[PDB]
Amino acid sequence: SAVKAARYGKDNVRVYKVHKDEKTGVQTVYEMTVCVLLEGEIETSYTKADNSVIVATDSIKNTIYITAKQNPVTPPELFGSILGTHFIEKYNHIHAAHVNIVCHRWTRMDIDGKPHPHSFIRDSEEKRNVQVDVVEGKGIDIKSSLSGLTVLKSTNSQFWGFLRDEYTTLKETWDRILSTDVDATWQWKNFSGLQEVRSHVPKFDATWATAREVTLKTFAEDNSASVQATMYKMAEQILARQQLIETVEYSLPNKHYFEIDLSWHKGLQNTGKNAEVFAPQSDPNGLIKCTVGRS
Amino acid sequence: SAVKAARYGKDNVRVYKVHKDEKTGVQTVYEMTVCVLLEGEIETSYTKADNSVIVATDSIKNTIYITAKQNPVTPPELFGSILGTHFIEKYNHIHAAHVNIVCHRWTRMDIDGKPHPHSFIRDSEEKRNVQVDVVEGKGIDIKSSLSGLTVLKSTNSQFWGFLRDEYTTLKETWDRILSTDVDATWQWKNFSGLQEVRSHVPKFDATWATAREVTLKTFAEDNSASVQATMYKMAEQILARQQLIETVEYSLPNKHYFEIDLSWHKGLQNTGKNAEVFAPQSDPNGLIKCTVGRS
Amino acid sequence: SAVKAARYGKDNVRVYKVHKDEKTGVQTVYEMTVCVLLEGEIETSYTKADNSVIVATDSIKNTIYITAKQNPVTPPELFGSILGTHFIEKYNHIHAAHVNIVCHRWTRMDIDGKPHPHSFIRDSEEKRNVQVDVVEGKGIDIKSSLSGLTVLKSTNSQFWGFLRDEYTTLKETWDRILSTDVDATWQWKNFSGLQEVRSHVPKFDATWATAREVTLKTFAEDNSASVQATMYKMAEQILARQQLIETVEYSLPNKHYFEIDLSWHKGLQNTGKNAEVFAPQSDPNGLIKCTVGRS
Amino acid sequence: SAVKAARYGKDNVRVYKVHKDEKTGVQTVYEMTVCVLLEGEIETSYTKADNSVIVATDSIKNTIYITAKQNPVTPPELFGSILGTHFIEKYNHIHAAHVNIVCHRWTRMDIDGKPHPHSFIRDSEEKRNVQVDVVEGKGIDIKSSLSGLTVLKSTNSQFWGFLRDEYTTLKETWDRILSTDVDATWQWKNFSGLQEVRSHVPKFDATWATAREVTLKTFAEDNSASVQATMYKMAEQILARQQLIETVEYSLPNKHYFEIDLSWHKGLQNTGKNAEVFAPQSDPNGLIKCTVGRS
Ligand SMILES: O=c1[nH]c(=O)c2nn[nH]c2[nH]1
Ligand SMILES: O=c1[nH]c(=O)c2nn[nH]c2[nH]1
Ligand SMILES: O=c1[nH]c(=O)c2nn[nH]c2[nH]1
Ligand SMILES: O=c1[nH]c(=O)c2nn[nH]c2[nH]1
Ligand code: NA
Ligand code: NA
Ligand code: NA
Ligand code: NA
């Protein structure tokens, strides 16, 4: 037998960092969960019990903390690039590093209309994420994403004109609830190394903000013909606004809210134009995906 | 043997309701999870297989939907009172109804600085809850709460002067991170019935808003001597602002963020005044509770 | 204002202990999650920022580890009694200790038909729990439980003869699926102190085993008239088998599996006697509770 | 812009099926969670609001139920192949179907030493899974797996001889706890179609059983030099026992149990050879992966 692929490292490394502005007293906090997996000339640890090639996972953990102490942790695209580059440069036999970062929200509190200098709220379980693959000789590949953005619109969603056959019971509709949890990923053009990543630093936060804004505005304003049609419009707009993105991927569940026929009870009307009370369905759910690129 | 206590009903009933203003086009959505448990002269269903005394749990579910169709679902204190009263009035042998409601956030989206008429975001997993106990002959007891409000302050928290003995390793500190998930409950004076609950309807939303505001402002502004001391200040202020509340209860975890000594690595300084990178701890956690009432 | 109640301590303390038999080489492992909350003359920590009365939660954590090192951790009723007694005896101003223990399963593996001396499997998320309340002057109150025991029977469950009115749509049935997650609690007679708890040590494991056996056998064998009727039979039998138990409480969800009418598709018959494929429902669920005591 | 990839369908479809042996009275239950995603000539649903190419996700759900009614649901490799083949044969414009099945445990209860004919227990959250990709013109690709198998050994695990540099604090050890959650996947050779899958039906359950047995026996018996070395031995043995498997992949977390130094308290010895009480760590965790194939 032979090792066809192998990677190993440390997952679920929770990290907090504070920045203190000595002039103003304002403090800013960052909290992340980090995973680093390494690849390289490590097969003999599997086949021959040769631990000499293993950078211990505990040491990977220490390295995450040290790197966060010595470098900016924002934007996460930069921090993940620094962290990944470290492993391939430090260890001759390590040839790829895969860094995943989940950023948690700590939003500054407003107290009496004023931003508070050192108090924060978790205002959403929405995350901002990065996946950074640093491969020796092949540069740095970055996928940025937002996830856990949960939205609902109560009208201006339709679904008609779909295929009807002997397996079909769904009725066409011109007015339904649309609710989803948005997972959106933008893949950057390959970067040659850390100097090129640093040269683009301003674009990372700006592109995250644009992706979020486009997602929310398009969801709210589109008189949606389907999840498919609405998500394509979102992706097109993101590509138009940032030329350094190569592809945009969306993964959207369709979280169903069913009408409840109450006509058996005193003729109560609660369907169609009279629908007011609905039953949210926990499962099953539709799942719609698309990857959009340039022509 | 004998039945000393019994209650039964339906849990995890998900309910959505939409209100449509025909004049303006503005729609407003409400989403809740409801549990109703009944008590009364039901022991023979347990002891003698006598199902004639059972209002089926499926029928309880139907009743929740019908009641939501025919009545306001907000404030939840009112809806829960209507729902509980229904069971004790409709069924002669049912003498108590226990209604728990969890309200989920659907906050109206702002698009280009304007509130959108029919699009919403789940802006927090914070919940607004009610527990309503309707007992025949004894009125209506309401406990209102907020839960899942997660906050952090990066300084202006201290903890010194605690008991030190042979079990103690904790160092005194004059500057630490304080983070918690707030669970706050206010218990209303007993109401005689639905007419009295209706007479106080404006106070329910106002008191929830006050409880939230006091919690956030006190957390942000107090130079905290302990979780205990800060939570007592919150409770006092809520009692001062609403005379119809009898008690306020807080349950606060102390979610620890530990310093990381990096001095073993090239003498890096990351403790005390030099602490920048911390390790959030998933467990264990402190748990601090208090119930405050009037003198 | 005044403090009406207060308790504080440490939650989610994970503990593992190994026992090694030097004669045989056999090792046995125990893993628990422990919470300890204290009460006593502690109000001034809340009202006056007086930390001198606070046994730090970190010290409570240390005490859990030390107590586990120096004492048996099984049965959990004994360990929780030792731990709770420690706090009220050590600290003059602490007058009650509330200890909750969740025991996790590590079942010895059988390899080639033989029990392995040091390898274990988590064979269920079923838990064995204890709640121990040690109150100065009032002895030791112990509630023992099992939870997370998930069962299903595919026939020999009925539900007919329930109340039918204008809120009822449920059809009577003489053959349905019954599935639940069992939470069963037995409350021991009050014990005067640790000497009396020790005197009854053999009864704790034996009574847990009996409660589990009775639950499973009664569920499997009863031609159930309702959840209510079946759970009462379980409780009666436990009380009959252990005279030192005062009450038994069951809390059972009714986890619904719905028939799927497929007759719209080529006349396929999948209801009633022809039902083979069902839709498990995640929510809502029935919730049935009873507490049974002696006459 | 252009659609580079697209797939859509229904997730989290819960399905139960019962088989009743009329001769013996014995009933057997199966419960699964199914996801089906389709690909094909569907881009215009995204780009042009053309729903005529959409087989509605609701219809996919109906098809899962109908297919389960008309066909065996075990082994899951067969059921997933039937389900996937259905979509590519029924719909000319659908060219791939991706079927994921999670099988939940319902193990027959033993009551008084005898297997009960119709009562079952969820004896583990361990799952048996399949991923079946049916691609028009390219056959059927099946990946079978087990997941959620949680094990611990209290000794006979070592970890020494790893790389030591300025980032390393971990001490070498010759005796530690090893605990993990096993995720093991075996990838079958490509099958030409449903006839070939049916021809191999007996091998599916047998290979699952072998994979489980090899995993448990190797974990229990290996005096482990590292997670890496132990998992490679498991994979080699599975490949040796089933020639129709092309690769085996393991993904193993290293769930750390830390020693607790108690020497600060009365010189208590709880490290090294005296270690009895340990602190299980919820995070971070090591994560070790390998894919093994033939030479
Ligand atoms: O937007 C939708 N897309 C779909 O593919 C679908 N199928 N059922 N409902 C649906 N709604
Ligand atoms: O605010 C705090 N209260 C406590 O009771 C405590 N114990 N350890 N740390 C603590 N912090
Ligand atoms: O066993 C049952 N008990 C109940 O109270 C009930 N209500 N609906 N179905 C039920 N099944
Ligand atoms: O088995 C192990 N493998 C590793 O790669 C490792 N790193 N720290 N500890 C470890 N244990
Ligand atoms: Na390298
Ligand atoms: Na009544
Ligand atoms: Na005392
Ligand atoms: Na086809």
Residue numbers in the entry:
A (entry chain A), B (entry chain A), C (entry chain A), D (entry chain A): 1 to 295
Authors' account:
Here, high-resolution neutron/X-ray crystallographic analysis at room temperature has been integrated with molecular dynamics simulations to investigate the hydration step of the reaction. To maximize the signal-to-noise ratio (S/N) of the neutron diffraction data we employed perdeuterated UOX (DUOX) instead of relying on protium (1H)/deuterium (2H or D) replacement of exchangeable hydrogens as done in previous studies on this system. The asymmetric unit contains a single DUOX chain that generates the biological tetramer of D2 symmetry following the application of crystallographic symmetry operations. W1O is hydrogen bonded to Thr57*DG1 at a distance of 2.16 Å. The visualization of W1 hydrogens allows us to also define an unanticipated O—H⋯π interaction with the ligand. Occupancy refinement for this atom gives a value of 0.78. In the final model the CA–CB–OG1–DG1 torsion angle displays a value of −110.4° resulting in a slight downward orientation of the OG1–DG1 bond towards the ligand plane with the deuteron at 2.77 Å from 8AZAN7, thus indicating another O—H⋯π interaction [Fig. 4(c)]. All deuterons bound to Lys10*NZ also refine to high occupancy (>0.90) with a hydrogen bond between Lys10*DZ1 and Thr57*OG1 at a distance of 1.97 Å. Taken together, experiment and theory (both standard MD and QM/MM-MD) are in excellent agreement and support the view that the minor crystallographic conformation favours the displacement of W1 from the peroxo hole.
